[PDB]
DNA sequence: GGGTTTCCACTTATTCAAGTTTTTAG
DNA sequence: CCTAAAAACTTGAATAAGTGGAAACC
């Protein structure tokens, strides 16, 4: 195939990517711990194709199943991490994950110098892991009773190719059949993301010249939606972005279906029985209906 | 060698994606 | 009346993040 666009790749990595650092107890390591560093992406078997395109683009990474319904692309070959670092130095992440990427660079530096085989090297990898993703494990915390200070990432959307990658991961295209003819057809575009990235989400309103932001939460967990319902905004500002900047994954299929329906709203055909039928058949075979 | 690296099978907590309603704007 | 648009919510699983186990390279 062809190279995945560098900016779509970072956009997909902001959404679905993950950086990893394993500090494991090992009775056979000079320092009692062995380490593994890398970057990984896990998807439904559905989108194995994405993983395989990212692999031939980077010429690194190993693909294996993850449970019965998922598939992962992991990169931990030390030398192959140079490729991941050459990418994100050129096409930096945008979300708070850039923080996890920076603590990923510092660990790579520790391991490039081979320090992680000496006592003080593992201590530094522990200070770093404390701030990366979910931080230290309890077994590991009680083993290392550390330093911190992680900066908040506050960047803006660099270009549209980034949005396509992010949306391919976090995007959502929905046809809302609203009761009451008694069935209003309303298109909906959604981006969902943890409240940790309030500032990025709010920039979608100005960046896309439409939409609105609301917060929901289940128990202690909160998140934000970016929602677009105005048809003219969807037909003129949202749809043209992703025609220009193609999406990846089966979600690409969902969008194309969304657009089929969009062209019916435009032609006013959804106000007729025969047209509302075709809209109903299109909703059936998209999203979880696919 | 054999410590260390790299890989393959697998698990889990929640952040997502997706869906369900009812109200408000025009 | 007549839709369009917005408000507000819930929910399960595809994520992200992590873990077990070991062949075997260097
Ligand atoms: Ca995400
Ligand atoms: Ca996704």
Q: Report the C-alpha gap between A41 and A58 in whole angstroms.
A: 13
CA atoms within 13 A on the CB side of A276: 13
Q: Structure resolution in Å? A: 2.6
> Does residue A172 lie within any of the structural domains?
yes
Breaks (C-N over 2.5 A) in chain A follow: 145, 180
> Does residue A148 lie within any of the structural domains?
no
Q: Is the CB of A106 under 7 A from strand B?
A: no
Q: Which stretch of DSSP H or E encloses residue A221?
A: strand A221-228
Other C-beta atoms lying within 10 Å of the C-beta of residue A115: 16
* N-to-C CA span, chain A: 25
Instruction: Return the nearest residue to B12, CA–C1'.
Output: A67
The answer to whether A55 and A141 are in contact (CB under 8 A) is no
Q: Are residues A197 and A278 in the same domain?
A: yes
Q: Report the C-alpha gap between A161 and A149 in whole angstroms.
A: 32
Instruction: Return the nearest residue to C10, CA–C1'.
Output: A218
Q: Are residues A167 and A259 in the same domain?
A: yes
**Cα A124 to averaged position of ligand 1 atoms, centre (Å):** 28
**Cα A12 to averaged position of ligand 1 atoms, centre (Å):** 9
> Does residue A149 lie within any of the structural domains?
no
Q: Are residues A24 and A90 in the same domain?
A: yes
Q: Are residues A17 and A107 in the same domain?
A: yes
**Domain CATH code at residue A83:** 3.10.28.10
- Kindly identify the ligand whose nearest atom is closest to the C-alpha of A13: 1
The answer to whether A261 and A234 are in contact (CB under 8 A) is no
> Does residue A199 lie within any of the structural domains?
yes
Q: Are residues A185 and A81 in the same domain?
A: no
Q: Are residues A10 and A127 in the same domain?
A: yes
Protein-to-nucleotide distance from the CA of A74 to the C1' of B7, whole angstroms: 10
- Token readout for A229 is 């319902």
Nucleotides of strand C within 7 Å of the protein's CB atoms: 2-20
Q: How many domains does chain A have?
A: 2
Q: Report the C-alpha gap between A174 and A65 in whole angstroms.
A: 29
Helix (H, G, I), strand (E, B) or coil at A25: strand
**Contacting residues 204-243/A vs strand B (CB within 7 A):** 218, 221-223, 225
Q: In terms of residue numbers, what domain contains A246?
A: 160-289
> Does residue A256 lie within any of the structural domains?
yes
Q: Are residues A199 and A253 in the same domain?
A: yes
Q: Are residues A109 and A167 in the same domain?
A: no
């Amino acid at each position: 195939r062809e190279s995945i666009n560098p900016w779509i790749l970072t956009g997909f990595a902001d959404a679905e990517g993950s950086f990893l650092l394993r500090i494991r107890n090992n009775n056979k390591s000079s320092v009692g711990y062995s380490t593994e560093l890398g970057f990984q992406i896990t998807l439904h078997n559905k989108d194995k194709s994405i993983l395989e395109n990212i692999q031939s683009t980077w010429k690194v990474g190993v693909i294996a199943n993850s449970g019965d319904n998922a598939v992962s692309l992991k990169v931990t070959r030390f030398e192959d991490l140079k490729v991941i670092i050459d990418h994100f130095e050129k096409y930096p992440l945008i979300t708070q994950k850039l923080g996890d990427y920076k603590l990923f660079k510092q660990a790579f530096s520790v391991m490039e110098n081979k320090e992680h085989l000496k006592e003080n090297g593992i201590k530094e990898l522990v200070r770093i892991k404390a701030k990366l993703n979910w931080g230290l494990t309890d077994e590991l915390k009680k083993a290392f009773p550390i330093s911190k200070e992680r900066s908040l990432i506050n960047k803006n959307i660099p270009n549209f190719k980034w949005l396509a990658g992010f949306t391919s991961g976090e995007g959502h295209f929905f046809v809302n059949l609203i009761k009451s003819l008694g069935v209003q057809v309303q298109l909906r575009f959604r981006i969902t993301q943890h409240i940790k990235d309030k500032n990025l989400m709010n920039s979608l309103i100005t960046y896309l010249g439409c939409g609105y932001i609301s917060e929901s939460n289940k128990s202690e967990f909160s998140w934000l939606n970016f929602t677009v319902t105005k048809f003219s905004d969807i037909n003129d500002k949202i749809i043209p972005v992703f025609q220009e900047n193609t999406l990846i994954g089966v979600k690409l299929e969902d969008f194309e279906d969304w657009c089929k329906v969009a062209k019916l709203i435009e032609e006013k055909k959804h106000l007729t029985e025969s047209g509302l039928d075709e809209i109903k058949k299109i909703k059936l075979n998209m999203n979880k209906g696919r």
